[PDB]
Amino acid sequence: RVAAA
Amino acid sequence: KNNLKVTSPDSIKGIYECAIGNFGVPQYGGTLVGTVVYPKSNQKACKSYSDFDISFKSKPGRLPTFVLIDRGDCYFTLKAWIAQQAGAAAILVADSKAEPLITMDTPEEDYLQNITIPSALITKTLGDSIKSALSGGDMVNMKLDW
């Protein structure tokens, strides 16, 4: 997945 | 979807998976060899390292500094910006949970286009291995080919 934090 | 090579010490050398951050194009493209440093304060790099009088500038003739940074409390991009400002040549963000790798993404709402240093998320396990090698006095060297 992706995430900003 | 990439990897990296811990070159030293023998106890943990090898090729490890990692997830390159989805922001910034590195200015000096190519291969990069560094020494890994785990900061004694501000380990999540959500505040400027100047407030702590901490710098990762390498002395002339010594390896560039790769700063190991813990995930948490602020955006990935801010950690890369903060560590860049302290003079690290690269940033490794140790994941906070043991889980497969995620790709660090940009937020929206700017300094973003000014981030240059290579960034990557590593697993908690490798994060813990590096910290224990450093805790025991061995310098941890590393090479990045991206």
The structure's method of determination equals X-ray
List B143's β-bridge partners, or say none. B5, B33
Distance in angstroms (rounded) separating the CA atoms of residues B35 and B119: 15
Q: Is the preceding omega at residue B9 within 30 degrees of 0, hence cis? A: yes
How many structural domains comprise chain B? 1
A4/B106 touch (CB, cutoff 8 Å), yes or no: yes
A1/B103 touch (CB, cutoff 8 Å), yes or no: yes
Strands (E), chain B: 2-8, 14-20, 31-37, 65-70, 90-94, 103-104, 119-122, 140-145
B75/A4 touch (CB, cutoff 8 Å), yes or no: yes
Sign of CA dihedral B80, B53, B58, B141: negative
From the list A1, A2, A5, the residue facing B75 with the nearest CB is: A5
Q: Give the resolution in Å.
A: 2.3
From the list B73, B74, B102, the residue facing A3 with the nearest CB is: B102
Where helices occur in B28-146 by DSSP H, the ranges are 76-85, 124-135
DSSP H or E segment with residue B105 = none
Q: Residue B90 corresponds to which tokens in the numbers above? A: 């690269």
Sign of CA dihedral B63, B115, B129, B41: positive
Domain boundaries, position B43: 1-146
